[PDB]
């Protein structure tokens, strides 16, 4: 056994080894920190050096759901309490009291306008003015909208967003009689959005999809884009789109998927949340 | 033994009739009573179990334990919250597949090595001439039973152990039990109290040479002398070889670094606040990444290459681990007949004209050995040709003269070989001069006469050529033949002759002198009747011409090999079963005992005192008779082995060989024996490595050894010792290079768990770096040469300098591995910050990074990522870490090319090492760029600017080791050498 | 620029690199 008080723990005196190791590790930490810092000196702080791994942005939905299935009982408030609580917690930033003029935010055109930019990416200009987006646009529920009032008028209103990407200005398609056939849609300033899932196979027209946003067209207004950076555009308010299903059958399991069309927006097979967006809705009575 | 019993007693003891023999009725029933007359079959070979005992070996235990633990972790993960990640199952399957794949390769390289000995052992004579009911029968030897009298002619092997009762000049060549090349006569009398050295019995499987002897069997089958001495399975097979002991130390004391490092971080997870089930998953993961799955498949290949190289030198190796055991070899043991000497007797010296003309075994008479122009030499050659009664076997003109079997007496065989080497075809000389009369050869007369004519056709002067030791012919010889002039009895020429003789019988040699007296034609005319029984010649009044020496010489390559072995720190000990004088003379000639070293007998003779009077420690070299070993205790053997120095054992029975081998092993030394006969089999079984001759080796000692010399050149053993030292050094270097790539495989998971950052290195990438790029370099590190002091290096002490020590582990885990991990992490940070995640924002992000639902993970800049995109970035960071590890391993291998000499000083002369580097880089590039594999092996291409991220770390490690080696060289024995030089 | 970076082309360069290094190593060991 390792004795003591007679000759030492395996001889030693345990200073040369300890001092050598500590000085070696100090030198190694020093060179590591120096390498990291000189690396940091070669990259910018306003724009990434690489953006290709960020494909056309994914259309993630705002209601966070664990098993990607919205299951709830309308009669019992506790069944869907978490969903509405999460929605109001997220949307408390979008409230009209948070949005104000005088270089906090800016006034923006009610109609979908051109994607106006603010200038270059250099630091000669401070925080560029950002648009505003109140909750007045969301509604059409024969009353106030709040966020997720909680009635059984179909289902709790789920609302979808586009992942903000630095220096990215989406381009809506520009042609006549494309593969998309909506009731009312004009090419500029809006990206058309459709919510159809497993059509003619299993869905068999379970419910009616109603979109309400800015400009009455099913899409994100273009005047908000493009992003400029958290360091350059703090508290940036991205455009939002809200959907509601009214005549949705109960006690039925259906799969509905919403996707956004665009010339520069891409779709992938492995990535099930890029561009398109899949979600499950289950309601029981 | 029942050799002291009379002939009458033996006849009644076995019911044998001393003349009639054994009747058919008795022999038929007693055959099945005592079993057949054959050796007991060797122990059963577990054909199917031997393979299963090779993949459960000393090193494969670690992987099997590692494989089981991996499956346990994955089974645990499935039971708890659903974890689709099978990374702990992919590793588990491939971990076991390494053992099975390398198990088959090890067996194939071993079963083939045992597929040659099957052809080596094939001999089924099984014949005898036994007398049953008074009739001789050429019956097969398989049925020979105790209780019948058997008859042996000349040129056939004995059927079993015999009690010789009537022999007529029968000489038997044992060369296997007593270790005697000289055929001793057989007579019904008693010679010694030891039946081994007696004269009235014959031993099993000892082919006779000449004479017919009648004997009664005493022991047959497994109970004979060969039956028991050659049936010792001893204890464990060579116990544990030195290399296998190092592996057992490398496992049971360097798996603790896995247990301690795993346990010391298991409680850290508990301190942080992780769950009970997750904590053990971390412990299993960190304790199994510490075992390298590239070291069992490298060590096995590294040893295979050396054996293949030694197979080119006709050094057949049985055990795959038998290459190393010849390396250390603290002490060595040998023999005499078969191993050191050629078991055949040749000419050595010819003394005449007051000169010694030492015959040269070399094929050119090197060093003016003899005067080949003198007329005395020609007359000596003529007398040798005439007096020879042997005949060279026909149809052998295409074979070397010394390696051809001949028929006749062994002394006549040496004479015939010498005559053939010197002049040419002896048959022409024999046929040129017709024979006239002959004289018998027997021990009763001890002098052989022969009558032959003259070479010149005219003046056919009748001469009676004679052969015999001059110590009995001097009183029967009057004049002397000296180059034409005759020297009669005088106090000068005869005293010079005696002086020349004196240092000929002192060499353990039976001098056979040459005599020939020319019978005058005045008294003995042309037609003189010649009768062998009647007296018609002059016994006295003879003359002398020259002397011959019949001592069997040692092998051509044995003295230089023994000298190099002694200079290499290996103590050489000679053990044999011959008379002490001949064994000591042969040892002195070989070089086993240093020149000028006087033994206790010589010291005693110096001042004419008993050997007890002189202090035993005065004489360093001593020779001990075998009859004292039975009266020697273990302490006496230890004290003579330690206090004294190189020594020679004489008249040692095989049990005494086992005793001395065990005693030498007891003192913490590694003993290699180089026996060749059948009496050395137990010693070869017990010795740490047994080297046995193949051409002249026996049938049971050859199969009970570890290395077999097909060429029978002793210098192959010194080649083997140098190769063993070299392969030990290369294995140490390769193990260090394989081990240093462990920290960059443990640190990623440690930082991923403790610091909560995205995983830097996956599991499949660890398998790739362990089995695809760290293998070919590891093998190629064993093809390199060593520093020029490999021959004079003292043998490694098997208790101080191990294969893996604390210095090597420290070097692999504290500095080199840390530098590699630092470079990999720098590359990982570089590639995860060029995409948006600044280094400061990575801390505390793993919980959200690995979540499937979170598809809006905001990075440092502000933009959000989905799950798939950030997973793609993580996987390309994995590939970056792999490439960085390869780039650092460039320098890791370059600095591991040598231990003391710098890279520039030693030089990069290895042609396979550069190919290893280039193949490493080629596999790294191809496996990270081949399209359509990122979905299977999970590797994505990286930008060209990212290949260079690991260059500064490789340069730093190369410079650091260059400085370290310079410090080691400049200050020998310093602190750095003490604490770093593994 | 969010567009793809030289893909379908960088694979060609990497494969060429790997093939060149493998061929050079084979040439060196053979000769």
Author numbering:
A (entry chain B): 19 to 303
B (entry chain A): 32 to 1013
C (entry chain G): 28 to 58
Task: Kindly provide excerpts from the paper associated with this entry.
P2-type ATPase sodium-potassium pumps (Na+/K+-ATPases) are ion-transporting enzymes that use ATP to transport Na+ and K+ on opposite sides of the lipid bilayer against their electrochemical gradients to maintain ion concentration gradients across the membranes in all animal cells. By utilizing energy from the hydrolysis of a single ATP, the Na+/K+-ATPase pumps three Na+ ions out and two K+ ions into the cell in each transport cycle. In this work, we focused on structural and functional characterization of the human α3 Na+/K+-ATPase that comprises α3, β1 and FXYD6.
To trap Na+/K+-ATPase in its non-occluded states, we substituted the four cation-binding residues (E324, E776, D801 and D805) of the α3 into alanine to completely diminish the affinities of Na+ and K+ binding. Using this cation-binding deficient 4A mutant Na+/K+-ATPase, we determined three cryo-EM structures of the Na+/K+-ATPase in its exoplasmic side-open state at 3.9-Å resolution, as mimicked the E2P state, and its cytoplasmic side-open states at 3.4-Å and 3.5-Å resolutions, as mimicked the E1 and E1•ATP, respectively. In consistency with the functional data, our structural data also showed a virtually identical structure of the human α3 4A mutant and the pig α1 WT ATPase in the exoplasmic side-open state. In the exoplasmic side-open state, the rotation of M4E distances V319 from L798 of M6 helix (12.6 Å Cα–Cα distance) and thereby creates an open K+ entry pathway along M4E and M6 helices. Our structural insights of the human α3 Na+/K+-ATPase in its exoplasmic-side open state re-emphasizes the rearrangement of the M4E20 relative to the M6 helix to open the ion pathway toward the exoplasm.
